[PDB]
């Protein structure tokens, strides 16, 4: 079966308009994947330890020590928006749809090829490449998710984003249990804190092998491998944002006095003394009904401690947060808090011809308003008694623990039974699409890395590896290290991801926000005179939705 | 039937998604119409003559003399985009659809009311208003289009554009035949040109009466009038523009030399001597194949004489043109040529609280590129022979007729059997929707005022009038002028216009142009502190389409 | 005209009108094109100057060909370089059938 | 039968000048070749096409 | 269409041929004011760039399904049936002067 | 522009922009690809329309 | 997915560690600290907590 193709290249997105404003989006994606034989045909338990860094007082957050099992397999990950949609498809979906549903997923591997490299080491000297017609490509599909879930989008290692650029898979590796202790300190700390890696707890040791837990297929040139169709189990993802705050929920106060002339300084007037008003409040001990005092249904968003690192049995880790935000976009300098930052390279959006090893990055700033402005928070004594007196207020300016740069807001947490919150928004093109749910008895209410989380069923990971091409001399009983003919493989990948979307409706008199090409961004969507390209990030929930 | 309503108020737009990316758009529009009794219950033949103006040499274009028949009826016109869609509906249609089809139209008149005004002329003195329960509102629907077609959008006189603002109909009047002669002149002209109104040609006289040619209904409070549904006869209207010029049609030249470094001055190079190239040309006498010389299929757009006034039996009139345009938008100062200019008032888009009698206006600048840049035109002798010599070129700089401000381009016309052209684009909210076809044997290939032209069938005009409320003293045999109780009427109007649209597809890698609200235009879509409003114009064909 | 010694009114002249009778373009052997695609404008040309046949609605689709990338053992998607690939070329036979 | 159009007329739009197209050319007693010009197509080709 | 630049398949059944590199036009604004030999100063000759509202970047991968053919493979287009008027192979010689 | 910079050379304008793709086109839309001189003579001499 | 080690040990040994081999502020991945370029094992983004 050498001279016969086993598949088709398809990278088209189809919209199929059903009934009742629901369309079916079929995203096809094909790619040529390049794969070299493993640097080692063995599994390894490698420890990483950068104590030299953290040894410097004040650097706890630069902790990198961990342990991982390095396997001789590669992972073919296509779980990122950029792998399926191009800028033009995203604009259509994001501008005209109101919500998204993830439906199916299926892959395929065809037109496999295995070449060999011979050192034509003559003068120059040289190199020769030849087909190894009887060689094999090993393929394993972990349908039962026996293996550790390792989504590549987290480290910018998924398949590439351009239909016409060959891509590659990533070396697979997973974490191995270890104990580590790191006591925090600051520049003025004395003596040496405590920074040790304790080793492994035998009761938490799990060494996984693909050979032992997954059936492997050997594909020769004439072979093809096709995953069946996987049908997802999820909630819909919204493509519209909310802008309401507790301050904009409900019936506003009745203005007994309205302006009578156009004018920036012509305001309306409630026209009633603040302690002589009517309405409901939750401050049982005052007569002041204010817009900051009046009672609202519940609470949109919450407060959490910031740049808080917690520690458990294997080192410090940052305390997660859902969303960030602020008022008049002090943007960028605005950033920080809980706005995701993505760093990527030449294959996932960075300008293709860019030299150097510095990645490209961006901080995604969502349209939703469900965050907090710490500088505006404050706490005061129940007696109320305005104007508040210094000993009766704790402002986000007063120090804590004596530290000049720490407030109570840094320690603060206002999550409770009244917290209303939104799931995470899609991030094009670098964001991950779906995630696997934690196998704990009590699960997170949402995942900070993907808008879709398969509870029960999640697609299995696909592993690939070039089978060993040994030379006439091979001795299993020797330390050496098997020597094998330099072999590599190229195969085509093809996936199909199906969504179900709901067409949007116009509910207000005014137009709304839409994604569009303009004089300014115009050149982020076309190649240059050298064929250089780049894929700029874009927002998903542009279009307000009322919350209450 | 006095205390019982005869209709419902509905001003909602519905999109009903059928099969195969085709949606059905139902636009409902309701309004409260106010109507006074006619200033005269008689038809009048009035002549307008402003010779004082045109008597001033050089003012021919300010000619206003005409003759019209002034009728005692009013017209209820709803043929303008603003009567059916609000900014939010337009953005949805314009951003997500690719073409429009006009399907039905139907109207209705309900909840009629007729009041009377009594001069409570006591001290202040005063006024009293009372219901005249037995009074009638006369309604006539000209289904067979017997009457002259007089679309109100041409003079900004259609129903209003805000669902919550009472509107009014316009006094109906039509043109009457007359002969007029006006000889052109300029500031330095001597003697007096010739500016006379000759009167009427008896063989062209047509005096129309609604009473004699249309059946009239008399509606009392308890009555309602409902037009059946009219189904249009038309072609589809496109919501995408073309950008290609003759210069961008076909296979571009093969570049034998491509850039090798990113850089504004790094150009490609055909790399072949101009008179040593291959391809086809229509200049049978040269060997130069240039991008301006190479042969193209036909010709996109044409040239016509500009600010050309022609004259026939009733005075001068401007020579019409389809579209205008230019390169790097020298915009506005760009304008002129054939870009429509709309002047309107408080009821159709002008800021509602604006004082004074000066209207609001705009020049619609289309996205399509099918116009000409006269400054770049030139004509040269067949011998060719470059560089062209002065006596062998006529530049749009060389004078004509000796006039320092006139070129050949002003006289120029290049319309022919190879002219490719586009129909006119929709103009929101002031543009007219449909038009009636000329009853000539050879019709225009398009109308410059509306994207839809019903050839065979066009909806009939609806006329309204308050029936005469006479006093105890009425004498038909006397010159006087009938005296009648001051009566007026208020009734609700309700229309339903149905379209059929085709959802758009994304055909390119790059995103495209979309209408959107931004920091700059944000306040054109919301009322102010006094309730002032305005309706800003918007473009319809934003989204390129390839022509060839 | 315009004072120019080498320009007439005929150079500016246009007599196209409602009475113009005209013929379509003639076939040119062997260099002439056979058919052409119609312009997607609302008002089309009465004829095309480059081909005697113009498919209004339906026109054959274009056929594109390309030699798929034959990479060497060294390929790095994340690098500026420019992929290096084994020098490959192709020869295939084409066969068409046009019926009149 | 036939019509008159401006000759060696170049018009301009948003992307540069282009020659005004014409349907057919011609003349009486074939002053042929020197006759040419007007609207008679000229074809330039190579070794593979003639 | 390649015939416009003399780039179609060859004309001899017994001579190997080749296809032409595909390329298409992209939108751009350019201004060139005409002049003649005696013109003074410098006319105006500038390339303004691209209008974002007319930008269309086409990729075959994204809009057309691609087939991969190995030696043992073949590709066959179905039959396309044209939509056109007939083409005449006879000329007219009459002028207004020879009508009637 | 070096060319058109020379007053009187407007018609030698070549400036344009094009997207260069990595694909090739197989075009057979020309009379010579289908008929040889002998076939053309037969069609042209004995037929009246095509 | 743990970080990709650009440098692996070559001898058995308690002090023979692997090495990410990339400057901390020149790495790729996702973080929730919108205002820094440091992608660390204590900084990198995890699904939840
Ligand atoms: Ca233990
Ligand atoms: Ca906001
Ligand atoms: Ca007469
Ligand atoms: Ca343009
Ligand atoms: Ca523009």
UniProtKB/Swiss-Prot annotation, chain G:
Species the sequence originates in: Feline panleukopenia virus (strain 193) (FPV)
Protein name from the UniProt record: Capsid protein VP1
Compartment(s): Virion; Host nucleus
Function: Capsid protein self-assembles to form an icosahedral capsid with a T=1 symmetry, about 22 nm in diameter, and consisting of 60 copies of two size variants of the capsid proteins, VP1 and VP2, which differ by the presence of an N-terminal extension in the minor protein VP1. The capsid encapsulates the genomic ssDNA. Capsid proteins are responsible for the attachment to host cell receptors. This attachment induces virion internalization predominantly through clathrin-dependent endocytosis.
Family: Belongs to the parvoviridae capsid protein family.
Superkingdom: Viruses
Subunit description: Interacts with host TFRC.
This protein's domain notes: The N-terminus of VP1 is sequestered within the mature capsid. It contains a phospholipase A2-like region and nuclear localization signals that might be exposed by capsid modifications during virus entry.
First and last residues shown, out of full length: 430 to 478 of 727
Any further remark recorded for this protein: The capsids of autonomous parvoviruses expose a proportion of VP2 N-terminus and part of that sequence can be cleaved of to form VP3.
């Amino acid at each position: 079966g050498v001279g016969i193709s086993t598949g088709t290249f398809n990278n088209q997105t189809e919209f199929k308009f059903l009934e009742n404003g629901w369309v079916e989006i079929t995203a096809n994606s094909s790619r040529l994947v390049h794969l070299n034989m493993p640097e080692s045909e063995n599994y390894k338990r490698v420890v990483v330890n950068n104590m030299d860094k953290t040894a410097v007082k004040g650097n706890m957050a630069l902790d990198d020590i961990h342990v991982e099992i390095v396997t001789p397999w590669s992972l073919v990950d296509a779980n990122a928006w950029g792998v399926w949609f191009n800028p033009g498809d995203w604009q259509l979906i994001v501008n005209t749809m109101s919500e998204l549903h993830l439906v199916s997923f299926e892959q395929e591997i065809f037109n496999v090829v295995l070449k060999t490299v011979s050192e034509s080491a003559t003068q120059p000297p040289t190199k020769v490449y030849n087909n190894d017609l009887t060689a094999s490509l090993m393929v394993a599909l972990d349908s039962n998710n026996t293996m550790p879930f390792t989504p590549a989008a987290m480290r910018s290692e998924t398949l590439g984003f351009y239909p016409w650029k060959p891509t590659i898979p990533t070396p697979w590796r997973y974490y191995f249990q270890w104990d580590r202790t790191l006591i925090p300190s600051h520049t003025g700390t004395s003596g040496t804190p405590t920074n040790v890696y304790h080793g492994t707890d035998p009761d938490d040791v799990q060494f996984y092998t693909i050979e032992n837990s997954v059936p492997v297929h050997l594909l020769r040139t004439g072979d093809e491998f096709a995953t069946g169709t996987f049908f997802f189990d999820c909630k819909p993802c919204r493509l519209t944002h909310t802008w309401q705050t507790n301050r904009a929920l409900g019936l506003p106060p009745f203005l007994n006095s309205l302006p009578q002339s156009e004018g920036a300084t012509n305001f309306g007037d409630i026209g009633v003394q603040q302690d002589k008003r009517r309405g409901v409040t939750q401050m049982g001990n005052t007569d002041y009904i204010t817009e900051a005092t009046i009672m609202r249904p519940a609470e949109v968003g919450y407060s959490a401690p910031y740049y808080s690192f917690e520690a458990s049995t294997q080192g410090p880790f940052k305390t997660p947060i859902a969303a960030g935000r602020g008022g008049a976009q002090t943007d960028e300098n605005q950033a920080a808090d809980g706005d995701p930052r993505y760093a990527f390279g030449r294959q996932h959006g960075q300008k293709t011809t860019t030299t150097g090893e510095t990645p490209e990055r961006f901080t995604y700033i969502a349209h939703q308003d469900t965050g907090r402005y710490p500088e505006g928070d404050w706490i005061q004594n129940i007696n109320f008694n305005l104007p508040v007196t210094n000993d009766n207020v704790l402002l986000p300016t007063d120090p804590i623990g004596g530290k000049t740069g720490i407030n109570y807001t840094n320690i603060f947490n206002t999550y409770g039974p009244l917290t209303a919150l939104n799931n995470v928004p899609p991030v094009y093109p670098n964001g991950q699409i779906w995630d696997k749910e934690f196998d704990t008895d009590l699960k997170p209410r949402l995942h900070i890395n993907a808008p879709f989380v398969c509870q029960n069923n999640c697609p299995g990971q696909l592993f690939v590896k070039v089978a060993p091409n040994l030379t006439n001399q091979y001795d299993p009983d020797a330390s050496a290290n098997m020597s094998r003919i330099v072999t590599y493989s190229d195969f085509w990948w093809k996936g199909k991801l199906v969504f179900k979307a709901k067409l949007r409706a116009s509910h207000t008199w005014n137009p709304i926000q839409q994604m569009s090409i303009n004089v300014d961004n115009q050149f982020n969507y076309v190649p240059n005179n050298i064929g250089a390209m780049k894929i700029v990030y874009e927002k998903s929930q542009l279009a307000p939705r009322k919350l209450y």
